[PDB]
Design a protein around this ligand. Structure first.
Ligand SMILES: NC1=NCc2ccccc21
Ligand SMILES: [Ca+2]
Length: 223
C-alpha cells in the first residue's frame, strides 16, 4: 500500500497473509474454513496466516493453517487477468474471535463514489521497494467505469473496477494482491493489478466480487 496508514494490530480481522515460506499475497476470510484471494496468487504449498499484524513476529493472536485445496475460477485468464479470483480451503476451521473474523460477501455491487478500505503488506513505495511488515490501510473511493476504462483503454472488463485517486500518490501495490477491498462492511473487491503503483491516471484495478457470489457460494457448498 502506497500512501496509506498503519491500520493497527488486528483491526482488519478478515485480512489474511498467504505464506509459502514467505508472505506472497493477501486474502480475505469469508467463513471459518474458506479464504478469497486473487487467481494470480495461485501456487502450491499455501499456508494461510490469520490474526497477523507484524508478519515477521509471532505476537500472540495468529493462527497458521495449511490449505487443503485451492480453486481458481474456471474462466480466469492470466494474460488479461479477467476473473482474477480463487478460493482457498483451510485444512481445519479457524477459531473465530474479535481478531480473526470473516467478512460478509456483498448483497449488491457497490457504486462509484463509495468509500472502501484496502489493506495489505505490500510495497509502500511508488519508486523502489520497501515492505512494511505491519498491515497498511488505505481509504479510497470506487471510480466510475468510464474513468476506469479511460485510464486503461482496452483492459477493463465487466469483472473489474478501479478504486483510488487519478492524481496518484495513494494505491495498492506489489504484495497486496489478493487482499480485500471492503465497502460498507462487505467484500467488494480483490486487489488485482495496476500499471506501477500510485502513478497519475493509473489507479488500482480490483476484481468485482459481486459478480462471483453465486460461484463462491456454490463452490463452498460442494467442496
Ligand atoms: N494497484 C496496483 N498497482 C500495481 C499492483 C500490483 C499488484 C497488485 C495491485 C497493484
Ligand atoms: Ca505475526
Amino acid at each position: 500500500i502506497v500512501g496509506g496508514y498503519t491500520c493497527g494490530a488486528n483491526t482488519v480481522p478478515y485480512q489474511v497473509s498467504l505464506n509459502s515460506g514467505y508472505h506472497f499475497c493477501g486474502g480475505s476470510l469469508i467463513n471459518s474454513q474458506w479464504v478469497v484471494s486473487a487467481a494470480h496468487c495461485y501456487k502450491s504449498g499455501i499456508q494461510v496466516r490469520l490474526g497477523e499484524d507484524n508478519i515477521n513476529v509471532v505476537e500472540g493472536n495468529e493462527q497458521f493453517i495449511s490449505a487443503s485445496k485451492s480453486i481458481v475460477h474456471p474462466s480466469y485468464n492470466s494474460n488479461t487477468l479477467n476473473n482474477d479470483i480463487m478460493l482457498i480451503k483451510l485444512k481445519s476451521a479457524a477459531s473465530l474471535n474479535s481478531r480473526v473474523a470473516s467478512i460478509s460477501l456483498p448483497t449488491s455491487c457497490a457504486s462509484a463514489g463509495t468509500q472502501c478500505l484496502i489493506s495489505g503488506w505490500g510495497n509502500t513505495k511508488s519508486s523502489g521497494t520497501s515492505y512494511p511488515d505491519v498491515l497498511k490501510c488505505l481509504k479510497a473511493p470506487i471510480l466510475s467505469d468510464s474513468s476506469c476504462k479511460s485510464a486503461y483503454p482496452g483492459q477493463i472488463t465487466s469483472n473489474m473496477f478501479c478504486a483510488g485517486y487519478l492524481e496518484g500518490g495513494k494505491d495498492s501495490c506489489q504484495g497486496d494482491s489478493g487482499g480485500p477491498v471492503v465497502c460498507s462492511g462487505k467484500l467488494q473487491g480483490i486487489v488485482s493489478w495496476g500499471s506501477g503503483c500510485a502513478q497519475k491516471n493509473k489507479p488500482g484495478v480490483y476484481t468485482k466480487v459481486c459478480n462471483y457470489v453465486s460461484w463462491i457460494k456454490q463452490t463452498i457448498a460442494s467442496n
